[PDB]
């Protein structure tokens, strides 16, 4: 079983985000750091949207991302700290749309070790040196200096290790071109490890040590060091030198203390909290992230707290020292992992969970009534900051991507044939039920019904220099309608077309002249009021036409071709010859003229005899055949386009065949576009020439980084389409529907999979699909939370305690506190507690966004498993059994008891009625039907329970589990239970004696998170360490039986995906293709594993991967085999993402790899695209 892993949707969760002039121009870029891929974003200052400029997979876990620039430079570098033992300096090359590695020096071994540097990386603000240190006992500082040819060069690194010392966070000090210092939070654990009494473990606070790097001595030494009052989580580098005083702000729990080095006194300020907070008072408050905005006049800081309270941090200072720290709450934001303050009022909010946000710095945060707690302001009591809406920034854009690794069910719940990916993703109040469909979002800007039966649509501008269209032509069956698009589009008659007849084509020939194509003749309309007519010769009529930028080809009846040439004086000149064809013309195509050239060379003409022929339009070989190509069906439409150009041709059936643009016909490709005639329409998508198909599904083909990408439209089918450009619609497409006109536009680039999210209340765990009701039953449970009735009781207790102060008693803040309900999705969820939880069961229809029913659990109730099936003792009534736990949290708090509630699923799965709630001694984490009964796994006890009138009667029990049953997949004959730290084992259930016997086990333990049965003896399971494994039972294993087990199961496939997988499903993503092992990720990524059908193709893919591992190394300095062999060694796994870089790599290296593979680079591209077309959308 040789498989081939492929990525369908990249990871959208960002772990780090930097801002600066990475492109070397005045525009600032946003370098985002995903899980296993690097991303370069460029926000539009006019449009307010963030576009992905580049996206490259680093094939490794990047743990640090920082930017730096030398003195007097104009471009910011990119320092990337990954899990490898090498430091990589990257320099994005715009003149190539790729990140060029400047330097790469190895420092240690691979892996996320404690003694391996790469976890922390600080850069100097002057760009003189960079410091990379590990979590403990390792620290290195390399010097960066420019060469004579302005090239960045690195020197030998300086070792600065310290034994038995742990580093929390490091940051470089802002020095005015002096000796650079690197401040970091240190903690000596030597005394705590040599004291069994535990006295040395207590009273051991963190010590802020500032290590200075002597440039004259070429060595670093710990110059300054001072202990702190409390433990710190992160630091904030204050700019010094000419702009502000030097120093750093140390963030801590409920306190902030900026303590500069030297004679500067320590000034501390407590963290302000929200007024009348519903959270627990015993829990502290720390900062989550911090942003710095530096200007020539002054500088400010923006740090978000644990509740997402973004406060505007300001520091009053004297001539040489700091006076006080004045903080003020700017607005309210979600929990963001990184914040980037850009120029011209732009704030990028990269959320740690859920969709991201990009608030633009609107207000300065000052000049308001908001109370700004100063550092000098004494308090013995913390400035209770009020939760005021962010009235200083405006979300310019949102990157709501993936970061869940929760649950996903890929099924065709809708009426369409293509299955949708119903994936519940989110965290707490930001959770949502997103149904992902592979398509494209169409934004209908205008829609108006059209009389009669329209057959075509056209849009021609007034001038060649005009940036927008001016005339819109609608061709009916017996006439033609022309409209003028000036933001008030109505019926127009003075255009000069005189549409009393249906029109075949309408475009602009000259710079300001128009050309209309009719079967009764040709009509030329210049800039002035002049009509140049050209009637058809004889009684024949024009069947088809082909217009261009400087060419006009027309086809009459009987295969009579007529060529018209555009004179440089502005007139049209007909050809001196008429070429005849062997059959009638059914399709004609004319490519656009180049800006350098004056005319097009190739002209495609489709015949009725199922054959395509190319005709040269040069004056040397005009009306001469160039290349012929047979077609399996009658052609319907043809269109040639650039990106290196290819000519597409659509047939009358649901299939189309394309060919390259050359003097001879080269490679060919085809796909089932169908039960509809495939028409070809040219469009402008993202500033590039794209093709728009007209069939039962409207697919838009567009190339993306030397790789084609064609997704269908998520709308109704259309008959004709044309590109549109106006002031209201800058980039749109006018599509003609059945007796209706619709002006749509494709704003979002949803080529991967478009999603529609239905929001939930808490973090979901698993979802169940009802067979008869066709609905979704998802349970949303989250720890450290309270229920709705518990929150209402806490609010009532707070309102009772607020009136207990007896303040003149006469002040009623309860009417403003209890009535005002703050949104948990926007202003954060006020939830706390150690053992408290909040579970909620809700049944919602997948077609709509509303929920049919909702069931709230108890206060200390937390559901972990859910199943919906029927009982053998009962009739056809589907029962929904959901197991919950009582008093649970983490490993320190041992689980108390458990319960299993039963639902009736009344009104054909529209309402749930609680029948019984059977308790349990252990927490149930497994519920699955098995031969009319329900298998209940509570802890390490696997019990088979039956349906009872009072409680679930357990008919069987099995205590052979190692630690705890985490998952259970039941085959028709056997049962496969998945342990927590042990690998899954196969167990046979005897129906005669009601005794479950384990007949197979595994030899290697793995922290399994999800699994799926591939066959009767082969099972594939995920790993918590970011790997994927597939175990197959041996054929000599005896299921009838009575270190741990005798029969062992061999692992036939193992591959480290690098992301936490929690959902696996083997199904067909597209009808007609092959089924693949589609897997989800916790970082918002979707992947698919496809098995190899041919041994020669598998060997070719293995040779291509072996060539690519030597020709294109990863940018993170790690090895591909070492990344694939992180947890388990690779066995029959081919990474298609590394093979996809052959089109993005160098052309000479691609030609060398193709010569080593004895093929062509387009042949290798076609062989790579064939597996994707066979296995994916």
């Amino acid at each position: 079983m040789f498989l081939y892993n492929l990525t369908l949707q990249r990871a959208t969760g960002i772990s780090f985000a930097i801002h600066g002039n990475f492109s070397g121009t005045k525009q600032q870029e946003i370098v985002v750091s995903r899980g296993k891929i690097l991303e370069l974003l460029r926000p539009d200052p006019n449009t307010g949207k963030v576009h992905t400029l580049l996206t490259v997979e680093v094939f490794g876990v990047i743990r640090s991302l920082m930017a730096f620039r030398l003195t007097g430079g104009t471009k910011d570098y990119i320092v990337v700290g990954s899990d490898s033992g090498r430091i990589v300096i990257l320099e994005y090359q715009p003149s190539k749309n790729m990140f060029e590695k400047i330097h790469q020096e190895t420092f240690g071994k691979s892996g996320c070790r404690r003694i391996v540097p790469g976890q922390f990386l600080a850069v100097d603000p002057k760009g003189r040196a960079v410091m990379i240190s590990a979590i403990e006992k390792q620290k290195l500082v390399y010097i960066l200096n420019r060469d004579a040819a302005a090239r960045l060069t690195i020197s030998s690194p300086l070792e600065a290790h310290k034994a038995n010392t742990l580093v929390y966070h490091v940051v470089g000090v802002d020095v005015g071109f002096e000796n650079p210092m690197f401040a970091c939070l240190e903690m000596d654990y030597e005394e705590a490890d040599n004291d069994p009494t535990g006295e040395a473990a207590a009273n051991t606070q963190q010590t802020l040590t500032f290590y200075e790097l002597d440039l004259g001595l070429n060595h670093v030494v710990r110059k300054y060091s001072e202990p702190l009052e409390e433990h710190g989580n992160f630091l904030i580098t204050v700019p010094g030198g000419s702009d502000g005083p030097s120093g750093v702000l140390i963030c801590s729990e409920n306190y902030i203390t900026y303590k500069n080095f030297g004679d500067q006194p320590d000034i501390r300020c407590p963290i302000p909290r929200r007024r009348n907070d519903l959270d627990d008072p015993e829990r502290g408050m720390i900062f989550v992230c911090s942003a710095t905005h530096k200007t020539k006049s002054m500088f400010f800081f923006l740090a978000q707290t644990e509740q997402g309270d973004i406060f505007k941090i300001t520091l009053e200072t004297d001539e040489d020292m700091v006076t006080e720290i004045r903080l003020k709450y700017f607005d309210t934001v979600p929990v963001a992992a990184a914040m980037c303050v850009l120029k011209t009022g732009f704030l990028f909010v990269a959320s740690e969970f859920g969709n991201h946000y990009l608030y633009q710095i609107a207000h300065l945060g000052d000049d308001d009534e908001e109370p700004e707690f100063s550092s000098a302001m004494p308090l013995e009591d913390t400035f209770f900051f009020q939760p005021r809406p962010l009235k200083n920034l405006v979300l310019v854009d949102e990157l709501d991507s993936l970061s869940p690794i929760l649950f996903c069910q890929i099924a065709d719940l809708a009426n369409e044939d293509t299955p949708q990916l119903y994936v519940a993703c989110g965290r707490g109040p930001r959770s949502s039920l997103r149904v992902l469909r592979h398509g494209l979002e169409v934004s209908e800007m205008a829609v108006s019904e059209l009389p009669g039966n329209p057959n075509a649509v056209w849009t021609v501008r007034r001038h060649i220099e005009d940036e927008f269209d001016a005339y819109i032509i609608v061709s009916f069956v017996n006439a033609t309608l022309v409209l003028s698009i000036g933001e008030t589009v109505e019926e127009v008659t003075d255009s000069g077309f005189l549409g009393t007849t249906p029109t075949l084509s309408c475009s602009l020939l000259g710079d300001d002249a128009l050309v209309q194509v009719y079967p009764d003749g040709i009509r030329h309309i210049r800039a002035d009021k002049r009509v140049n007519e050209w009637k058809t010769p004889g009684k024949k009529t024009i069947v088809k036409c082909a217009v261009n930028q400087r060419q006009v080809v027309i086809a009459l009846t009987g295969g009579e071709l007529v060529y018209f040439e555009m004179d440089p004086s502005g007139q049209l000149n007909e050809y001196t010859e008429r070429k005849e064809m062997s059959a009638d013309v059914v399709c004609m195509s004319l490519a656009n003229v180049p800006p350098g050239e004056q005319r097009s060379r190739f002209l495609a003409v489709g015949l009725v005899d199922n054959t395509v022929r190319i005709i040269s339009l040069d004056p040397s070989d005009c009306l001469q055949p160039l290349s012929m190509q047979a077609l399996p069906a009658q052609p319907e439409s043809l269109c040639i386009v650039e990106m290196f150009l290819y000519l597409n041709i659509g047939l009358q059936n649901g299939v189309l065949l394309r060919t390259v643009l050359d003097p001879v016909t080269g490679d060919l490709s085809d796909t089932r576009t169908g039960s509809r005639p495939v028409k070809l329409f040219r469009v402008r998508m993202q500033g590039q020439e794209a093709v728009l198909a007209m069939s039962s599904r409207s697919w838009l083909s567009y190339s993306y980084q030397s790789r084609f990408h064609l997704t269908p439209l998520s709308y109704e089918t259309l008959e004709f389409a044309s590109g549109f450009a106006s002031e209201q619609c800058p980039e749109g497409i006018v599509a003609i529907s059945t007796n209706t006109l619709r002006i749509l536009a494709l704003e979002k680039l949803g080529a991967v999979f478009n999603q529609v999210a239905f929001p939930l209340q808490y973090t979901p765990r698993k979802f169940v699909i009802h067979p008869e009701s066709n609905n979704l039953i998802i349970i949303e449970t989250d720890h450290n939370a309270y229920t709705e009735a518990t929150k209402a009781q806490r609010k009532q207790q707070m309102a009772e305690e607020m009136v207990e102060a007896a303040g003149e008693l006469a002040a009623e803040m309860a009417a403003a506190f209890l009535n005002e309900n703050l949104p948990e999705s926007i202003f954060g969820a006020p939830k706390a507690g150690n053992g408290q939880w909040a579970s909620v069961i809700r049944v919602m229809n997948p077609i709509q966004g509303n929920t049919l029913d909702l069931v709230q659990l108890e206060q200390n109730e937390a559901a972990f498993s859910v199943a919906v099936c029927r009982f053998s003792n009962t009739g056809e009534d589907w029962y929904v059994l959901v197991g919950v736990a009582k008093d649970l949290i983490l490993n320190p708090r041992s689980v108390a008891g458990g319960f299993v509630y039963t639902y009736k699923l009344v009104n054909n799965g529209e309402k749930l009625e609680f029948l019984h709630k059977t308790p349990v001694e252990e927490v149930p984490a497994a519920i699955a039907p098995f031969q009319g009964r329900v298998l209940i796994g509570v802890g390490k006890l696997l019990r088979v329970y039956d349906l009872g009138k009072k409680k679930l009667l357990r008919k069987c029990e099995n205590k052979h589990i190692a630690n705890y049953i985490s998952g259970i997949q039941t085959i028709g004959h056997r049962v496969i239970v998945s342990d927590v730290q042990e690998s899954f084992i196969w167990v046979r259930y005897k129906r005669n004696e009601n005794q479950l016997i384990i007949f197979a086990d595994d030899t290697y333990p793995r922290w399994v998170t999800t699994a799926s049965l591939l066959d009767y003896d082969t099972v594939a399971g995920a790993d918590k360490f970011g790997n994927i494994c597939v175990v197959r039972l041996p054929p000599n294993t005896n299921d009838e039986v009575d270190n741990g087990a005798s029969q062992k199961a061999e692992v036939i496939m193992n591959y480290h995906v690098g992301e936490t997988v929690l959902s696996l499903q083997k199904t067909t993503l597209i009808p007609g293709g092959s089924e693949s092992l589609v897997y989800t990720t916790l970082s918002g990524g979707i992947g698919i594993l496809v098995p190899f059908t041919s041994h020669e193709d598998h060997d070719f893919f293995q040779h291509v991967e072996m060539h690519l591992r030597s020709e294109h190394p990863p940018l993170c300095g790690r090895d591909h085999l070492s990344f694939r062999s992180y947890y388990f060694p690779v066995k029959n796994v081919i990474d298609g993402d590394l093979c996809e870089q052959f089109n993005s790599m160098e052309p000479n290296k691609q030609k060398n790899v193709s010569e080593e593979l004895d093929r062509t680079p387009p042949e290798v591209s076609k062989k790579l695209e064939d597996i994707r077309t066979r296995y994916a959308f």
Binding site: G654, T671, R672, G674, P1071, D1170
Partner: peptide
């Protein structure tokens, strides 16, 4: 490779047909 390639083309056929459905 070539013989397989002949087969490969057929393989493509199935997927294309699937798309049509």
């Amino acid at each position: 490779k070539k013989q397989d390639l002949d087969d490969e083309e057929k393989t493509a056929k199935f997927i294309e047909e699937q798309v049509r459905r």
